Short mmCIF file of C-alpha atoms and ligand atoms in Angstrom, two decimals:
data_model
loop_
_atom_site.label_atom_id
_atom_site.label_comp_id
_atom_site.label_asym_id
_atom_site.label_seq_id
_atom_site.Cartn_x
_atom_site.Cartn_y
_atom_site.Cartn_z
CA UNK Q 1 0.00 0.00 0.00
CA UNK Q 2 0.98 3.58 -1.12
CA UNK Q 3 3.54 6.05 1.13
CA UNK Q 4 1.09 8.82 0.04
CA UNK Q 5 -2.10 7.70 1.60
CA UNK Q 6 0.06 8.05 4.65
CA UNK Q 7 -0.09 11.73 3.65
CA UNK Q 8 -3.78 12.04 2.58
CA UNK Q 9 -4.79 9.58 5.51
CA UNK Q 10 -3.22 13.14 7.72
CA UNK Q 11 -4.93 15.97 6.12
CA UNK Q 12 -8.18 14.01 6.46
CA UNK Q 13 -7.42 13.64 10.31
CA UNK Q 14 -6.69 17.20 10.65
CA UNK Q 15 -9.57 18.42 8.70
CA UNK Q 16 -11.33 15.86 11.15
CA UNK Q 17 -9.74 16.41 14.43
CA UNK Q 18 -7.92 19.84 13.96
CA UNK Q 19 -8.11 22.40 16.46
CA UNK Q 20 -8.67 25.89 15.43
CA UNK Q 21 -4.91 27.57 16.34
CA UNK Q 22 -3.43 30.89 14.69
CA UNK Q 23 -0.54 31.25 13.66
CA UNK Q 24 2.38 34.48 13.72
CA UNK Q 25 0.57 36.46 11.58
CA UNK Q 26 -2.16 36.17 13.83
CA UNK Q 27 -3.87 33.70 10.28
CA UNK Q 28 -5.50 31.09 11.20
CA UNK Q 29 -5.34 26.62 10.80
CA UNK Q 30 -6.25 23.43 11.57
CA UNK Q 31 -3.52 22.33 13.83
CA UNK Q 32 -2.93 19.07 15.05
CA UNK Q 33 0.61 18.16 17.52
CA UNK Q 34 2.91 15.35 16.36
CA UNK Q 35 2.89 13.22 13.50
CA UNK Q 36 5.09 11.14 11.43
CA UNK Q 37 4.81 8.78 8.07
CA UNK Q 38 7.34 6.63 6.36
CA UNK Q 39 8.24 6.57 2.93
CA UNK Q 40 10.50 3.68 1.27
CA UNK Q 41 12.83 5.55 -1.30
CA UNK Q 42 14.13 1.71 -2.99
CA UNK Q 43 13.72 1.67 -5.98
CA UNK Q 44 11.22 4.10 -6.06
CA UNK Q 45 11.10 8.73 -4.82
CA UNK Q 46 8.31 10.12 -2.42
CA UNK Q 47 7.72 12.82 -5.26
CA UNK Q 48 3.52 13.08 -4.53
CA UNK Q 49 1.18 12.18 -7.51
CA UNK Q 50 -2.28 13.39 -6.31
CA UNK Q 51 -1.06 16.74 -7.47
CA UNK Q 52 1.61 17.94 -9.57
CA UNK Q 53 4.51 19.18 -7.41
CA UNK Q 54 7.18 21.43 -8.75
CA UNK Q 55 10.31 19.33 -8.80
CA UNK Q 56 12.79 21.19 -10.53
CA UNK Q 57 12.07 23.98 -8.28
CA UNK Q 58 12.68 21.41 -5.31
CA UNK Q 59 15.83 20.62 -6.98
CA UNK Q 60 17.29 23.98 -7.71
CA UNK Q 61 16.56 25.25 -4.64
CA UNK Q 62 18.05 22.03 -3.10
CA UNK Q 63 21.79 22.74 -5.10
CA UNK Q 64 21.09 26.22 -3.75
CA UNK Q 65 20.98 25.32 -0.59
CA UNK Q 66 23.59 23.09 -1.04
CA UNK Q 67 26.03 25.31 -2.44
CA UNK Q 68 25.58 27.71 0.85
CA UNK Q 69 24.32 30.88 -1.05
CA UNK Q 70 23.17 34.19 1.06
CA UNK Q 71 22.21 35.52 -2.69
CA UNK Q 72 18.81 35.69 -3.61
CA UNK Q 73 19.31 35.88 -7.31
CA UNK Q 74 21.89 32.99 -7.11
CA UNK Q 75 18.54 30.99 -6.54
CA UNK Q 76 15.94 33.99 -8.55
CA UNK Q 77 17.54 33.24 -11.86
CA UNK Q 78 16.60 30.03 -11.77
CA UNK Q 79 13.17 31.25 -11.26
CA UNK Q 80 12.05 29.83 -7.65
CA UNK Q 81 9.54 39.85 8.73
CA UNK Q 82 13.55 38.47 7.80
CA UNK Q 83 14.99 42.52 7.13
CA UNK Q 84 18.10 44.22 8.24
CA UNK Q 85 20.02 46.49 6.31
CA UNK Q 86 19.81 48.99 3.48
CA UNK Q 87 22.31 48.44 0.57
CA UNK Q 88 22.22 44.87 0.85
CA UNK Q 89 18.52 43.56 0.36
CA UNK Q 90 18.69 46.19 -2.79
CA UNK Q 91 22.12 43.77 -3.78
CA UNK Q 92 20.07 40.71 -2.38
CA UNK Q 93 22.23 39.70 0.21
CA UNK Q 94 20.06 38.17 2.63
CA UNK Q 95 22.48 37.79 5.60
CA UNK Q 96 23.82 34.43 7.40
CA UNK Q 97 20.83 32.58 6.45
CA UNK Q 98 19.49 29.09 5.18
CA UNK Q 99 22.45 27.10 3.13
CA UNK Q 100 24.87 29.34 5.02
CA UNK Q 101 24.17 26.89 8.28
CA UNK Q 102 24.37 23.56 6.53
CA UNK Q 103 28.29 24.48 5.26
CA UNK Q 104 29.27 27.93 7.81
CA UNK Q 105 27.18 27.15 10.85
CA UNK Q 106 28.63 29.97 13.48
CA UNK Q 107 30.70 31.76 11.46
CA UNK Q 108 31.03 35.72 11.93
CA UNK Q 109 29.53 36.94 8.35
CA UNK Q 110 31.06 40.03 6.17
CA UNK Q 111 29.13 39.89 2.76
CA UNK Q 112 27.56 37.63 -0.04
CA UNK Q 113 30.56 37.34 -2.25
CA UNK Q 114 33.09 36.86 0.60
CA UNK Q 115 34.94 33.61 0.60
CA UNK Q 116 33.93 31.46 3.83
CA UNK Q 117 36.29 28.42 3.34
CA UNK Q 118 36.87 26.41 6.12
CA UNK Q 119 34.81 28.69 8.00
CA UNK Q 120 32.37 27.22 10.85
CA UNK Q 121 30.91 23.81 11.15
CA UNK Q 122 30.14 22.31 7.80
CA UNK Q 123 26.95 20.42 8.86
CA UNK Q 124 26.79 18.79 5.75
CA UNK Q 125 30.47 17.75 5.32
CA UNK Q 126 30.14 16.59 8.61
CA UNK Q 127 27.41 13.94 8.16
CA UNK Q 128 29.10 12.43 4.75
CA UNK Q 129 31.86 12.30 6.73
CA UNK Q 130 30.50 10.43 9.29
CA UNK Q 131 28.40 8.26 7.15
CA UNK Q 132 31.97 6.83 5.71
CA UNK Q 133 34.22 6.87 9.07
CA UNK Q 134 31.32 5.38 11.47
CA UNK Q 135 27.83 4.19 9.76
CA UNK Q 136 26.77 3.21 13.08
CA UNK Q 137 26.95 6.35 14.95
CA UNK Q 138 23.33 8.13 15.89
CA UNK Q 139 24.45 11.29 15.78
CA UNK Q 140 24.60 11.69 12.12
CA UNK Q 141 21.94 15.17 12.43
CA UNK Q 142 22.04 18.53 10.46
CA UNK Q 143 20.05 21.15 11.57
CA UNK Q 144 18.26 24.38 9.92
CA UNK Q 145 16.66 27.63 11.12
CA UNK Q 146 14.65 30.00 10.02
CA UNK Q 147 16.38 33.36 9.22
CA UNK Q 148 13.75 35.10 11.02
CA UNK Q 149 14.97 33.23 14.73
CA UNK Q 150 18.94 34.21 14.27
CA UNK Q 151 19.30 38.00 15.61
CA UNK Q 152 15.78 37.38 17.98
CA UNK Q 153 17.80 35.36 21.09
CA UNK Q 154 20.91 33.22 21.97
CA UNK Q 155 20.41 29.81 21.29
CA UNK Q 156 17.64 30.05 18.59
CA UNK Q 157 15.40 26.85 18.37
CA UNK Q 158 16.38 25.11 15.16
CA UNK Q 159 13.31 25.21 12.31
CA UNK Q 160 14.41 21.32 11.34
CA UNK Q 161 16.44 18.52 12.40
CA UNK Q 162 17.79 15.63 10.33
CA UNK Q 163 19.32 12.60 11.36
CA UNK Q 164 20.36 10.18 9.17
CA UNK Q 165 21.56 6.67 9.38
CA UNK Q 166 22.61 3.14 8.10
CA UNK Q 167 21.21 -0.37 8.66
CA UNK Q 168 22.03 -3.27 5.81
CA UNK Q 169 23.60 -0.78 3.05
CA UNK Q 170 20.03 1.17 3.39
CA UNK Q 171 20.49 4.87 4.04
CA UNK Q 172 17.33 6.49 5.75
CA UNK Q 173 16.15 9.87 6.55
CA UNK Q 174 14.59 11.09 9.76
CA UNK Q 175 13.29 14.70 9.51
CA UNK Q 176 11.91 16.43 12.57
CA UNK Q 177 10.19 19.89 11.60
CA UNK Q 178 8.93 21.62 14.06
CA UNK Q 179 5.66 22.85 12.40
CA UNK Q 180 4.59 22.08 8.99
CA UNK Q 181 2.64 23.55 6.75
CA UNK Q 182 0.66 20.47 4.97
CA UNK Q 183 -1.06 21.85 1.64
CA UNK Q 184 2.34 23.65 0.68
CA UNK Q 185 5.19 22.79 2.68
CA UNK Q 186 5.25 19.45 3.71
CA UNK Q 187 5.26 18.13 0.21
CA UNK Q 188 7.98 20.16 -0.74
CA UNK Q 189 10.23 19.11 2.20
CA UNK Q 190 9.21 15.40 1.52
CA UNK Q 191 10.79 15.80 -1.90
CA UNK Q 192 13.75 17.98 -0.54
CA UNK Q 193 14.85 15.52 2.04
CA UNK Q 194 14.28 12.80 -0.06
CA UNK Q 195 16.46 13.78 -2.83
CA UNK Q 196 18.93 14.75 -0.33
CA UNK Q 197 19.22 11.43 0.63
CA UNK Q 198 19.29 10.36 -2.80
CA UNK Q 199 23.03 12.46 -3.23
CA UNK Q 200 24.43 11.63 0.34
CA UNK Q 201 23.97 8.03 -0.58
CA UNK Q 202 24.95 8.42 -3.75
CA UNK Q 203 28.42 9.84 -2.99
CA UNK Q 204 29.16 7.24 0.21
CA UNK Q 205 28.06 4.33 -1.90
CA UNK Q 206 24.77 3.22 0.19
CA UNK Q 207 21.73 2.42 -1.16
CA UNK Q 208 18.65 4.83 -0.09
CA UNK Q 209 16.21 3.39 2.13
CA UNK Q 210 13.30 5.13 4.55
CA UNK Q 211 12.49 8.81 4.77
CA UNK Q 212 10.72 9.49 7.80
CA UNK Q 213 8.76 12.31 8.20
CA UNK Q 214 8.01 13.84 11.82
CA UNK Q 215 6.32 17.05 12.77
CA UNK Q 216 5.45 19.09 15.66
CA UNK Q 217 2.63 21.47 14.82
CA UNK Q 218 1.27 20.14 11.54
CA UNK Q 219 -1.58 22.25 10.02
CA UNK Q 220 -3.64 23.54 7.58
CA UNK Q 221 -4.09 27.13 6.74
CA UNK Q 222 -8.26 27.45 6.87
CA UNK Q 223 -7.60 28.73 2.89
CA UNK Q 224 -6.12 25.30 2.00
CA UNK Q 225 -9.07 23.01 3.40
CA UNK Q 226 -11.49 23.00 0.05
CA UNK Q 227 -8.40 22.69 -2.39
CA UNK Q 228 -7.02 20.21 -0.05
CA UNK Q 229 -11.04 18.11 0.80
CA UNK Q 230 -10.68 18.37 -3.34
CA UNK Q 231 -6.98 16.41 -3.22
CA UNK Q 232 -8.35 14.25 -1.07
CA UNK Q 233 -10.31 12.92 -3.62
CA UNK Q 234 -7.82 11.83 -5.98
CA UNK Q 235 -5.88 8.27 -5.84
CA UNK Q 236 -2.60 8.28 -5.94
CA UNK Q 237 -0.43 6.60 -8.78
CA UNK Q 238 3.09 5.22 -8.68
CA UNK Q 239 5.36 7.00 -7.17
CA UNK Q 240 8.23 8.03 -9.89
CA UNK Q 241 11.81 6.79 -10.15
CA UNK Q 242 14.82 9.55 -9.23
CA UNK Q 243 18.03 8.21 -11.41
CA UNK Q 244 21.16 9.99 -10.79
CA UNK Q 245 23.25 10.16 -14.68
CA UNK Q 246 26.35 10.68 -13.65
CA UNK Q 247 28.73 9.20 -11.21
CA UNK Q 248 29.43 11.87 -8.67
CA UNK Q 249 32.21 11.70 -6.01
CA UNK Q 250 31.32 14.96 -3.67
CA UNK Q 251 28.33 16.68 -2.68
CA UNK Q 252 29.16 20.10 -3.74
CA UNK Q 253 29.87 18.75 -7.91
CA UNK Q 254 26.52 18.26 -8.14
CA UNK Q 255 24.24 19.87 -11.10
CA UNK Q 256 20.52 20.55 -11.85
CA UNK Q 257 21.25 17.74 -15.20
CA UNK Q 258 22.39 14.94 -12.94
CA UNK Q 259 19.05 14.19 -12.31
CA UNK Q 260 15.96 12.79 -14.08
CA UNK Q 261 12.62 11.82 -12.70
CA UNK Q 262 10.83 8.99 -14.44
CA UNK Q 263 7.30 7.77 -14.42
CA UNK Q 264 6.12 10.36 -12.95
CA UNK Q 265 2.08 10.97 -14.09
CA UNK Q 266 0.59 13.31 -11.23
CA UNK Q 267 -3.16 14.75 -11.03
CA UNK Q 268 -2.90 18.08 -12.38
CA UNK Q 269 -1.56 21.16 -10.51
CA UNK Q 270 -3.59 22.59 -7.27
CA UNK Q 271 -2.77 25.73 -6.74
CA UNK Q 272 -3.03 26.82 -2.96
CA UNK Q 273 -2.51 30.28 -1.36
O1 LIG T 1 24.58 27.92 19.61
C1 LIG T 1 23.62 27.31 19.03
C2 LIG T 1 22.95 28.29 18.35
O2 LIG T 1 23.16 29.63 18.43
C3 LIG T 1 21.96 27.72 17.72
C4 LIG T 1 20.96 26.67 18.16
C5 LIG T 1 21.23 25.41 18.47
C6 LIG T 1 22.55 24.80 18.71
C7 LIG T 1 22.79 23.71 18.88
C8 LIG T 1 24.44 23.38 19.25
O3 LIG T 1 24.47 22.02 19.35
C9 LIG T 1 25.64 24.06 19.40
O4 LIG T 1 26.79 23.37 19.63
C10 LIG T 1 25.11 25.42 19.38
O5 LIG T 1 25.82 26.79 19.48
C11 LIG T 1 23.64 25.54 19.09
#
């Protein structure tokens, strides 16, 4: 039985049992505390067929967060509250934010276009490297915050934890978020982490296995619910196959054409707020 009735089975038990909860912007959703589903990436990629979700966009955004950029058009030429500063959000230099934590995590930052080699924790280095010195170890975890937390307190509350790890040459994916969005967000981050694990695999020679995905507040914003009671709906088809075209030795080589989705034939595009 499908992965994504895992995912339809929860916005039918928050449109059921959701509490009314708003959120920052004092907007309002169907909220619902903790949940989590599986999906088996062998041989096949949680990319969600009950409506057509943007993958290249998941992708590019992906090798831009990958890369480390704190440049918005580095990302907006691909087509795809958080202020500060003059100058530099005309320039588009969006401070030490996103990507920049995954490869420069703590790292004093100057500018956009500085070079930041060697510079902080490299989150990301740091859990291939692991994967290939000790594949047993459970602390193979990369975290991410939201730009908006940084300059608001000491010790900001990370946005998302991942933690990966290695049973029988399967690489799986645990990612804790803690709130998701589920008409827009979550299947985004499904695809996100999943390809993710796709490349880490790739390069330390494992074969993918489970992404699991956990949340904290999981919701629905009240403008989502008919769009989303109209998903619901829909039965879901096979998921797709991700095939990787090249061989690729390090996680920073790869490019937008390394990849190619396959049998993928999704209901057509919702369009939510
Ligand atoms: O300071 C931290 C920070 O400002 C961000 C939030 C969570 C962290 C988690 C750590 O494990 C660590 O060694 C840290 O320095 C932090």
């Amino acid at each position: 039985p499908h992965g994504e009735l895992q995912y339809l089975g929860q916005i039918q038990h928050i449109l059921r049992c959701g509490v009314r909860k708003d959120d920052r912007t004092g907007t309002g959703t169907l909220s619902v505390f903790g949940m989590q589903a599986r999906y088996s990436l062998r041989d096949e990629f949680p990319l969600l067929t009950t409506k057509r979700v943007f993958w290249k966009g998941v992708l590019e955004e992906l090798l831009w967060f990958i890369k480390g950029s704190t440049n918005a058009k580095e990302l907006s030429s691909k087509g795809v509250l958080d202020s500060l500063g003059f100058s530099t959000r005309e320039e588009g230099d969006l401070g030490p934010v996103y990507g920049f934590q995954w490869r420069h995590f703590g790292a004093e930052y100057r500018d956009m276009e500085s070079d930041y080699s060697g510079q902080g924790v490299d989150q990301l280095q740091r859990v291939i490297d692991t994967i290939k010195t000790n594949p047993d170890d459970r602390r193979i975890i990369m975290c991410a915050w939201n730009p908006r937390d940084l300059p608001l307190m000491a010790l900001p509350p990370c946005h998302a934890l991942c933690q990966f790890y290695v049973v029988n040459s399967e690489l799986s994916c645990q990612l804790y978020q803690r709130s998701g969005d589920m008409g827009l967000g979550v299947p985004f981050n499904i695809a996100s982490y999943a390809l993710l694990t796709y490349m880490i695999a790739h390069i330390t020679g494992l074969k993918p296995g489970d992404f699991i995905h956990t949340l904290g507040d999981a919701h629905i914003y009240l403008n989502h619910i008919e769009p989303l009671k109209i998903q619901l709906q829909r039965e879901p088809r096979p998921f797709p196959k991700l095939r990787i075209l090249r061989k690729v030795e390090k996680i920073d080589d790869f490019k937008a054409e390394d990849f190619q989705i396959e049998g993928y034939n999704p209901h057509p595009t919702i369009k939510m707020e």
